[PDB]
Amino acid sequence: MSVAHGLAWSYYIGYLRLILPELQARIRTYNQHYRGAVSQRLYILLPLDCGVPDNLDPNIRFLDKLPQQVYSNSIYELLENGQRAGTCVLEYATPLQTLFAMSQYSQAGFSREDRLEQAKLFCQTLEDILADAPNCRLIAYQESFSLSQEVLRHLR
Amino acid sequence: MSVAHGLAWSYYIGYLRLILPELQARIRTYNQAVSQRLYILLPLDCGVPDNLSMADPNIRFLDKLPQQRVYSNSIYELLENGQRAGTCVLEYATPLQTLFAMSQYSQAGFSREDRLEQAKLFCQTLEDILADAPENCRLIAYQSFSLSQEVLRHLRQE
Ligand SMILES: CCn1nc(C)cc1C(=O)/N=c1\n(C)c2cc(C(N)=O)ccc2n1C/C(C)=C(\C)Cn1/c(=N/C(=O)c2cc(C)nn2CC)n(C)c2cc(C(N)=O)cc(OCc3cccc(OC)c3)c21
């Protein structure tokens, strides 16, 4: 019954439930067609400070788009000690942009303290929705800091 | 900090604030009449059908609103006494689909009574965001029934 609950349900109903059923087959088509294979599962970055940059760290490099289906998903390499240590489909949780905007607009009556509480609640709520819906993994973190090491810990 | 508050802000930040600044130029290009506002249908029961061009016999698809993301918007004629009584850009408020889904799934802990309360609060919150937003968008909230008469009542106020 919070801001976070509506955002988690909208993100699941309006996006994840529509793209997750076909993701495994798209990754497989990419790996079969074309060092190291693209890991299965969609990795969602959840910066709890709600700082979502315009273009997804020196050790996270874009490689290619995945074959569509009107969904654009990107494959990245993760570097460790300067070399490729993993490859995966990665993307930011867009509802955290709305939490950031609500903290910025006075009309929302939503403080930066409310924002962090709702970001944590969004992560927990989304985790619980996905646990009850049998190809996805949430990477929550609060930002020196290495995002590549954060993703690599989940991949391994 | 209610469910409605987050849905109204996501719908504004992630859709309306991006589409509304170019709406007047798109309507002007088609007219050069179609009303100057985006009319958003808000069925408070949260029943959003798959196709608006088949929702009412007196709401007929006229044309796609041209370009001046690439947004797809539709222009409809509203009939009264079998004749064109108004023309406007019309579409359903998609966040009401999430309110419907939350009432359907036990995990959400969200009753049909909560759904209607949040649907009304979503309408109020969105109207207040749009009233103060930068200087073209009207909300049509409603619960035999004529949807064309509902839209025409709003159009005739403008
Ligand atoms: C919606 C689920 N969701 N809930 C929360 C919380 C956050 C998210 C979320 O972030 N959603 C998405 N992600 C991460 C996505 C990633 C990918 C990918 N991998 O490529 C692809 C799609 C993705 N979507 C779906 C989006 C962005 C829409 C459907 C936007 N949209 C929209 N929105 C609303 O209903 C809504 C309700 C609430 C509440 N808040 N909103 C605003 C978001 N309406 C009416 C739209 C109408 C039109 C029109 N008139 O034709 C067009 C739209 O968008 C054309 C478009 C085209 C291409 C790229 C593009 O942007 C990528 C957008 C409309």
Residue numbers in the entry:
A (entry chain A): 153 to 186, 191 to 212, 216 to 228, 239 to 303, 308 to 316, 322 to 334
B (entry chain B): 153 to 184, 193 to 228, 238 to 304, 308 to 315, 322 to 336
Original authors' sentences:
To elucidate the differences in molecular architecture between orthosteric STING inhibition and activation, we determined the crystal structures of human STING155-341 bound to the orthosteric inhibitor, diABZI-i, and the orthosteric activator, diABZI-a1, derived from the diABZI series. However, the differences between the two structures are unexpectedly modest with a r.m.s.d. of 0.548 Å2 for all atoms. Moreover, both compounds adopt similar positioning within the binding pocket with no obvious mechanistic rationale for their reciprocal functions evident in the crystal structures. Both compounds elicit a disordered STING lid organization that does not extend over the binding pocket, which has been previously described in both apo STING and STING bound to cyclic-di-GMP (cdG), a bacteria-derived STING agonist. Another well-reported feature of cGAMP-STING binding is the shortening of the apical wing distance between STING monomers. Both diABZI bound structures adopt a splayed open conformation with an apical wing distance of ~47 Å and ~52 Å for diAZBI-a1 and diABZI-i, respectively. Therefore, the totality of our analysis indicates that STING155-341 crystallography cannot readily distinguish between diABZI-driven STING inhibition and activation. In contrast, diABZI-i demonstrates expected inhibition in the WT THP-1 cGAMP stimulation model (IC50 = 3 ± 2 μM) but potent agonism in the V155M SAVI model (EC50 = 17 ± 7 nM) with a > 170x increase in potency relative to inhibition potency in WT THP-1s.
In this work, we use an orthosteric STING activator and inhibitor from the same chemical series to discover that STING M271 is a critical residue for molecular activation. The M271CH3 NMR chemical shifts reveal a unique molecular signature for pharmacological or genetically driven activation and inhibition that is not able to be resolved by other biophysical methods.
